[PDB]
Ligand SMILES: CCCCCCCCCCO
């Protein structure tokens with residue numbers, strides 16, 4: 001579905017701290033509750049030497065804000081990674097490395113606007129909303145700076 | 155794919171202790187390593203009053219044997235349940251409640267032979283192998299009684 005990838009992506013430069021400022025999904029039930037399957041809060045990106053992408057995130061599971069480690073394996077396309085499951089692609093749509101990164105995960109579909117700091121970046125949200133115009137989204141969430149500094153954005 | 159369901163299933167009677175004696179899958183990578191996506195060890199079945207099925211299992215994630223709680227929501231078919239994800243069906247193929255329960259999960263496909271006790275039940279494995287003859291499986295695992303009494307069947 002997603003036909004926006006970052007040309008010339010350098011995966012090593014996305015390493016470090018990120019905040020899930022905004023999230024959108026094709027299906028309300030993917031994001032509606034704290035325990036919703038794609039309500040995931042990114043903490044850190046850890047690209048490996050071989051160019052895989054380790055993801056540290058937080059996810060509400062069985063009443064607690066749990067820490068999870070995901071590995072997204074590189075493909076022939078620098079901006080596309082695969083997670084192992086009962087087959088889920090991560091696409092990097094756009095990043096400036098310093099401030100924002102837009103990504104989508106698709107099997108049904110969820111996208112996030114990541115930012116380096118706990119601040120509302122109007123420029124990153126404009127770019128996120130433009131990228132979503134092309135996509136069939138039915139739920140969109142954004143978080144305030146107080147929530148961004150809390151586990152699972154409470 | 156799976157066209158074997160238990161007629162007349164009483165979900166309340168599957169409550170309590172189970173052991174993942176054998177596992178099979180359509181794809182080697184679904185079961186090959188300890189961290190493989192469908193290498194899940196059932197601990198307990200907890201049907202709810204409303205006829206949902208809570209599952210307690212163990213799964214190897216990031217170097218540890220972790221405890222997980224899954225909820226499989228009932229459908230119009232008593233032997234079929236749905237898990238919420240980026241859409242996975244659990245089918246109960248066959249059970250005698252007292253000794254064995256055969257189930258499959260499908261989106262790609264994994265089936266298990268569950269038994270009430272840490273013993274190799276030749277009758278339950280015969281029934282499991284018969285149920286699999288109809289299915290496109292490419293990996294099959296079974297565990298010994300020592301492994302069945304260990305976390306993640308170490
Ligand atoms: C830009 C890289 C961030 C990807 C996060 C993918 C989260 C995986 C979803 C687990 O259900």
Ligand SMILES: CCCCCCCCCCO
Nearest residue numbers: 191194209224244257259
């Ligand atoms: C017979 C009921 C046992 C169903 C177990 C389903 C396990 C869910 C798989 C999570 O990845």
